[PDB]
Amino acid sequence: RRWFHPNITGVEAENLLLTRGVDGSFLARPSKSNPGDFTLSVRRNGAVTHIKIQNTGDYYDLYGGEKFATLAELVQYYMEHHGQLKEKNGDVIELKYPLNCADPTSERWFHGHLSGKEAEKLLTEKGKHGSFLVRESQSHPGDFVLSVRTGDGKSKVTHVMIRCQELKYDVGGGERFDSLTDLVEHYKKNPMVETLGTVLQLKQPLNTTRINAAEIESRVRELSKKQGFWEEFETLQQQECKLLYSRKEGQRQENKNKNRYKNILPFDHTRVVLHDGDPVSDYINANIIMPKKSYIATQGCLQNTVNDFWRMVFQENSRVIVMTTKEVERGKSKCVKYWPDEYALKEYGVMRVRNVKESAAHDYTLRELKLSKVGQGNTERTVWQYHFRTWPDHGVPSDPGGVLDFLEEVHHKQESIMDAGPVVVHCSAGIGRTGTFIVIDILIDIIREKGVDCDIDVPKTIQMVRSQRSGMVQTEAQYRFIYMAVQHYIETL
Numbered sequence: 001r002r003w004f005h006p007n008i009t010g011v012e013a014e015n016l017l018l019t020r021g022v023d024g025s026f027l028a029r030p031s032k033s034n035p036g037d038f039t040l041s042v043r044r045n046g047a048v049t050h051i052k053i054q055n056t057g058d059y060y061d062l063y064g065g066e067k068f069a070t071l072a073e074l075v076q077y078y079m080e081h082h083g084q085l086k087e088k089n090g091d092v093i094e095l096k097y098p099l100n101c102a103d104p105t106s107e108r109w110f111h112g113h114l115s116g117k118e119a120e121k122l123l124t125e126k127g128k129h130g131s132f133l134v135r136e137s138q139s140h141p142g143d144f145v146l147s148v149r150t151g152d153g154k155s156k157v158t159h160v161m162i163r164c165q166e167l168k169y170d171v172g173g174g175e176r177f178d179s180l181t182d183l184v185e186h187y188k189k190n191p192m193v194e195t196l197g198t199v200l201q202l203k204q205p206l207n208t209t210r211i212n213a214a215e216i217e218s219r220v221r222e223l224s225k226k227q228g229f230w231e232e233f234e235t236l237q238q239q240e241c242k243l244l245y246s247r248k249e250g251q252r253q254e255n256k257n258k259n260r261y262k263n264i265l266p267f268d269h270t271r272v273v274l275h276d277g278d279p280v281s282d283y284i285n286a287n288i289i290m291p292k293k294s295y296i297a298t299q300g301c302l303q304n305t306v307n308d309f310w311r312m313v314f315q316e317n318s319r320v321i322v323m324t325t326k327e328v329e330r331g332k333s334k335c336v337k338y339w340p341d342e343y344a345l346k347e348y349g350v351m352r353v354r355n356v357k358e359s360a361a362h363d364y365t366l367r368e369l370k371l372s373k374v375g376q377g378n379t380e381r382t383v384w385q386y387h388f389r390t391w392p393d394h395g396v397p398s399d400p401g402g403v404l405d406f407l408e409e410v411h412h413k414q415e416s417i418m419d420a421g422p423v424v425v426h427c428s429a430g431i432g433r434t435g436t437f438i439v440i441d442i443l444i445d446i447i448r449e450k451g452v453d454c455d456i457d458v459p460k461t462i463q464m465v466r467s468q469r470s471g472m473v474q475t476e477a478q479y480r481f482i483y484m485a486v487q488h489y490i491e492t493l
């Protein structure tokens with residue numbers, strides 16, 4: 001993900017492309033005018049074009065282009081679909097040459113100001129064999145140190161000096177690298193060997209995000225001090241080029257119109273496969289998400305996917321559905337009404353649904369549904385639809401109390417139902433709000449059964465969920481809200 005530059009301005013992007021790029025070179029960067037948005041900066045015929053990318057919480061919206069689940073999938077799409085990106089006037093913008101960033105601030109292993117002994121205590125406490133980090137040198141300004149743990153007495157910490165000479169980095173001899181990232185990547189593949197023989201293997205960065213549950217308030221205070229939240233979120237975003245798993249089934253011609261957004265697709269390896277269809281009937285835009293409960297993350301139904309939605313719910317034995325959007329928000333349709341009116345009964349293809357009773361709370365409506373296969377009364381089961389209604393049109397809720405009390409009720413419903421399947425969670429595209437609810441539920445469930453004596457690692461949890469559906473958790477404001485929800489839950493114990 002070298003083409004994303006987290007700390008550059010528009011002017012700096014123009015100069016970088018004009019002095020170090022060619023026609024077809026590109027980078028992406030956060031938008032300094034509109035916080036939370038991003039800009040694609042592309043060079044063409046010796047001129048730079050800036051293309052705005054919005055994310056209000058549901059997807060990345062490329063102005064004059066399509067909607068995507070991550071910046072990496074967006075870049076992958078246009079680099080592999082030439083003449084697909086059109087401009088203002090309608091002319092082709094070619095993304096050909098990523099312009100690599102040299103900034104290490106978004107790398108998991110870069111700690112900046114850190115003493116040799118502070119790094120030793122961190123590596124002693126949370127480090128493993130091959131855990132490493134890079135820090136500024138405390139004696140030679142402008143130089144850095146690579147601190148590695150290999151392995152009382154059986155393990156050690158080795159400090160390797162990295163000198164910076166003319167904006168090139170080296171470990172005292174050999175090759176000179178254009179960035180710390182290149183240096184780390186090289187000595188990851190070609191590990192340094194010590195004179196006496198020890199191999200300084202760079203296996204994984206030192207974890208700094210896993211904390212004890214009781215430490216959340218302190219960590220939140222730290223991140224609240226360009227704030228730590230932004231830095232941690234962007235570092236997580238920098239890992240998304242590891243998650244470009246294939247989505248071939250969703251791109252098939254017969255499945256295209258089963259997607260609310262043509263380029264927001266389920267990974268083939270975790271997609272819910274619909275099994276006994278009408279003699280392509282196996283496709284729905286949905287993924288299994290596994291952390292005790294499992295989830296299905298899915299989009300709001302389209303008119304032509306309501307039948308497939310109920311086949312999924314039936315086949316997977318799901319007994320709880322969590323809907324996190326209104327049907328209509330800001331005059332836009334985000335989910336068709338896939339359930340009957342209270343007391344009514346409808347057939348959706350071969351599936352029959354009765355709306356038994358609705359119960360309203362302030363934050364949500366609960367719909368007691370009875371689902372069965374037509375022609376087979378012995379297949380009936382109750383499906384409890386929790387329709388969250390108070391998520392704001394802009395941003396995230398200011399207080400997590402409503403979301404937390406909602407998930408607490410959903411969790412107890414699920415736990416009270418013997419052998420219930422995954423909980424279905426959906427919004428519009430099924431990645432932003434849907435990922436946020438699912439991540440909070442996963443973290444809360446650890447604390448619910450372990451109290452404060454448990455580790456929580458928010459970005460690791462998100463990355464694990466992002467490997468099972470694209471772009472789970474869309475924004476920094478959602479990232480922050482997840483931390484705020486976890487803090488509030490721990491405090492009300």
Ligand SMILES: CC1(N)CCN(c2cnc3nc(Sc4cccc(Cl)c4Cl)ccc3n2)CC1
Binds near residue numbers: 105232457
């Ligand atoms: C100052 C920093 N440069 C950025 C902030 N700060 C870090 C450090 N690791 C981070 N790591 C992640 S993602 C992840 C987390 C756990 C386990 C696994 Cl496997 C993954 Cl992939 C997401 C944000 C981070 N943020 C320390 C270094």
